[PDB]
Amino acid sequence: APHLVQVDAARALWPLRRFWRSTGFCPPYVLSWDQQLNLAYVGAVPHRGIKQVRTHWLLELVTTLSYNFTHLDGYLDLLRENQLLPGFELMGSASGHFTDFEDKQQVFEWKDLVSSLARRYIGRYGLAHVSKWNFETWNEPDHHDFDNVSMTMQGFLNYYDACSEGLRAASPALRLGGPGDSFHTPPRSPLSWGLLRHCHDGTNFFTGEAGVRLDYISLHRKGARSSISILEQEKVVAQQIRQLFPKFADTPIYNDEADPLVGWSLPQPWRADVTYAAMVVKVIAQHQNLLLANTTSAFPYALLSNDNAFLSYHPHPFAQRTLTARFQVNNTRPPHVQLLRKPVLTAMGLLALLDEEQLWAEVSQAGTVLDSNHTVGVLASAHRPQGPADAWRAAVLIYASDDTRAHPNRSVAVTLRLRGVPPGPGLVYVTRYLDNGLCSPDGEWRRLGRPVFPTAEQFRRMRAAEDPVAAAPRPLPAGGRLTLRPALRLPSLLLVHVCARPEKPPGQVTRLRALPLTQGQLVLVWSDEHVGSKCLWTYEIQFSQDYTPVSRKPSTFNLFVFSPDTGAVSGSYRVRALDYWARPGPFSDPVPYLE
Numbered sequence: 001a002p003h004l005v006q007v008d009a010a011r012a013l014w015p016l017r018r019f020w021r022s023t024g025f026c027p028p029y030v031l032s033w034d035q036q037l038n039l040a041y042v043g044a045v046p047h048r049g050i051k052q053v054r055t056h057w058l059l060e061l062v063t064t065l066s067y068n069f070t071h072l073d074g075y076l077d078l079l080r081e082n083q084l085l086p087g088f089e090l091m092g093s094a095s096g097h098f099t100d101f102e103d104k105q106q107v108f109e110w111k112d113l114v115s116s117l118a119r120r121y122i123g124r125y126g127l128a129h130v131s132k133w134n135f136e137t138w139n140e141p142d143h144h145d146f147d148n149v150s151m152t153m154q155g156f157l158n159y160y161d162a163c164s165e166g167l168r169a170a171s172p173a174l175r176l177g178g179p180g181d182s183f184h185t186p187p188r189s190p191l192s193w194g195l196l197r198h199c200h201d202g203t204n205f206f207t208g209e210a211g212v213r214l215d216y217i218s219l220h221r222k223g224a225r226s227s228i229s230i231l232e233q234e235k236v237v238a239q240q241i242r243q244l245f246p247k248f249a250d251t252p253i254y255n256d257e258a259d260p261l262v263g264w265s266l267p268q269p270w271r272a273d274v275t276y277a278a279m280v281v282k283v284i285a286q287h288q289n290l291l292l293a294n295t296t297s298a299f300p301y302a303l304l305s306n307d308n309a310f311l312s313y314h315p316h317p318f319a320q321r322t323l324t325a326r327f328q329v330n331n332t333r334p335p336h337v338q339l340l341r342k343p344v345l346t347a348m349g350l351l352a353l354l355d356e357e358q359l360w361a362e363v364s365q366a367g368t369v370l371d372s373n374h375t376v377g378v379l380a381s382a383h384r385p386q387g388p389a390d391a392w393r394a395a396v397l398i399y400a401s402d403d404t405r406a407h408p409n410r411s412v413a414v415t416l417r418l419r420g421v422p423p424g425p426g427l428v429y430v431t432r433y434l435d436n437g438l439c440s441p442d443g444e445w446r447r448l449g450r451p452v453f454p455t456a457e458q459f460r461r462m463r464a465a466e467d468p469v470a471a472a473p474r475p476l477p478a479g480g481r482l483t484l485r486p487a488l489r490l491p492s493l494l495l496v497h498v499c500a501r502p503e504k505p506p507g508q509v510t511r512l513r514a515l516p517l518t519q520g521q522l523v524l525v526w527s528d529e530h531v532g533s534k535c536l537w538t539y540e541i542q543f544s545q546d547y548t549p550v551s552r553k554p555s556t557f558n559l560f561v562f563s564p565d566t567g568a569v570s571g572s573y574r575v576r577a578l579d580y581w582a583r584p585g586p587f588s589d590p591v592p593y594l595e
């Protein structure tokens with residue numbers, strides 16, 4: 001019996017927030033060319049699909065009473081250039097200065113450091129930008145990862161008050177949360193539970209007032225290979241917080257390390273391809289449909305982050321918990337680094353097309369209704385037109401996922417019945433499909449024989465599997481209805497995108513950049529902020545030597561590796577958007593490049 005999926009486009013039930021637009025990593029580097037390419041890939045996810053990079057040890061990029069912020073300036077400028085925000089963990093010793101947060105003088109000094117850095121980047125980027133940053137406490141305070149810093153229970157409370165008063169001294173508009181740990185049953189997790197008590201009922205180190213600001217509560221809960229287990233654990237902790245700390249009943253909860261499995265560097269075949277991608281989507285659907293979609297308990301769940309911005313290493317380029325797959329090519333003159341886009345990163349681009357209202361949807365099999373706690377599920381959104389540059393849109397994202405298990409032998413019959421699409425001009429739909437057969441760079445790597453130092457040709461062949469199989473825009477049937485019967489594989493993802501025609505064509509592509517990889521090989525990366533519509537077929541790239549169109553298969557990811565057979569890359573480049581009705585947007589400013 002096939003899976004039946006119905007979507008009611010006429011039933012916009014409630015807001016749908018893109019709560020999953022976060023990644024993160026821990027340095028072992030942050031200014032290396034490897035990292036610069038990595039963050040270019042992360043920022044290239046369309047429509048701000050990844051917004052935050054939660055980065056450990058940021059205050060080891062400051063040296064020491066005056067401070068040198070050079071290395072921190074560099075990293076934060078790097079994020080800014082890629083339209084990314086720091087998940088700013090106030091974590092580090094300022095290169096050995098801080099050693100003890102029960103030393104009164106050190107507590108005052110920490111406050112002044114935090115004030116200085118906060119005011120510095122307010123000056124550097126503006127208060128409007130810095131007020132969006134999730135400042136956070138030291139990572140996992142109950143896992144004793146403090147190097148040479150003494151952090152007792154009392155020290156952690158003093159530290160927190162310095163963090164909070166230091167940020168306030170910069171501006172009251174800045175946001176601070178924590179503890180970013182797992183909240184195990186007492187007597188476990190004493191610093192986590194202690195922080196909440198302190199903020200709820202304790203005394204401020206600096207002011208002596210009862211209670212201390214806490215803008216959000218961050219936890220870490222990982223699935224041990226189970227998707228639904230993440231959600232189950234979060235509900236337990238959230239309820240405990242609600243009853244034990246009534247003032248925090250409406251305090252936003254973050255799970256900013258919500259991964260399928262602990263230990264990012266452990267090689268796992270399922271991390272290499274669409275298995276991981278589909279599980280990530282499944283976890284997100286479970287959170288929207290079983291936690292946020294008008295549940296009786298209604299916990300204030302606000303953010304979910306997959307901690308997968310790490311760079312992979314030899315001999316596991318694809319098998320680690322990373323958005324990209326790194327190849328250090330050591331036999332070129334000089335040695336260079338290349339990155340590939342893993343399906344999980346591509347999947348963040350499909351998620352990014354989900355809009356601000358959730359539509360009514362039901363999955364069933366043989367009359368039995370199945371919620372997102374099953375192998376097949378759906379998230380469906382609608383968009384209210386903003387101006388002449390956009391129109392009505394619907395995005396239906398369907399996953400087939402058995403968590404960390406793939407099933408190459410199996411095929412999942414699915415019948416999608418879309419109903420109630422509101423009438424409008426040039427209504428078309430476009431399907432985007434991912435599975436391990438057609439669109440897995442790891443799979444291509446292995447068909448090529450697993451080359452350790454891939455050639456230019458081998459990279460082209462691997463990159464040819466990055467994008468989803470996209471079907472050309474077809475007119476929507478009459479009555480605002482669409483019935484499709486795809487044969488989904490396990491794992492797979494299917495995005496059906498139904499768009500009405502906007503009045504104006506797409507806007508201008510902006511902030512084009514050329515980044516060198518090696519001889520005759522280069523990355524083109526751009527912003528899509530002013531494009532003004534999500535209904536895009538591809539981005540046309542043109543190259544001039546004295547402009548001709550660079551021929552490539554369709555892709556809406558804001559990054560392209562140009563690697564021509566001739567090796568001629570010197571000249572000027574320009575890029576523009578192309579919508580589902582073949583209408584071009586204006587060209588970006590031309591970017592020159594000389595090799």
Ligand SMILES: *[C@@H]1O[C@H](CO)[C@@H](O[C@@H]2O[C@H](CO)[C@@H](O[C@@H]3O[C@H](CO[C@H]4O[C@H](CO)[C@@H](O)[C@H](O)[C@@H]4O)[C@@H](O)[C@H](O[C@H]4O[C@H](CO)[C@@H](O)[C@H](O)[C@@H]4O)[C@@H]3O)[C@H](O)[C@H]2NC(C)=O)[C@H](O)[C@H]1NC(C)=O
Nearest residue numbers: 027028034265313314315316327328329330331335452453
């Ligand atoms: C081409 O050239 C590049 C640049 O020179 C080489 O890059 C090195 O690659 C190796 C992997 O082959 C890297 O070494 C590995 O680093 C891992 C992470 O290290 C950090 O984290 C650990 C643990 O937290 C710390 O101990 C460590 O100090 C670092 O902070 C380690 O996990 C690896 O060790 C594990 O595997 C080895 C097997 O070799 C076991 O012996 C160990 O017990 C352990 O299980 C490993 O050390 C290295 O960091 C890379 N250097 C750089 C600068 O990037 C490429 O290897 C080379 N390519 C080829 C094909 O030769």
Ligand SMILES: *[C@@H]1O[C@H](CO)[C@@H](O[C@@H]2O[C@H](CO)[C@@H](O)[C@H](O)[C@H]2NC(C)=O)[C@H](O)[C@H]1NC(C)=O
Nearest residue numbers: 228229231232233235286290371372373374375
């Ligand atoms: C998700 O579904 C699983 C089953 O697939 C649920 O786990 C079962 O829970 C019941 C409790 O009524 C137990 O009796 C069973 O032993 C469990 N079965 C298995 C296979 O583990 C789980 O409770 C569901 N979770 C949510 C949040 O709906």
Ligand SMILES: *[C@@H]1O[C@H](CO)[C@@H](O)[C@H](O)[C@H]1NC(C)=O
Nearest residue numbers: 062063064067068069070071
């Ligand atoms: C700060 O550190 C940078 C990087 O190490 C170095 O180049 C510079 O000399 C330092 N600046 C000052 C003012 O000490």
Ligand SMILES: [Cl-]
Nearest residue numbers: 259260261321
């Ligand atoms: Cl994982």
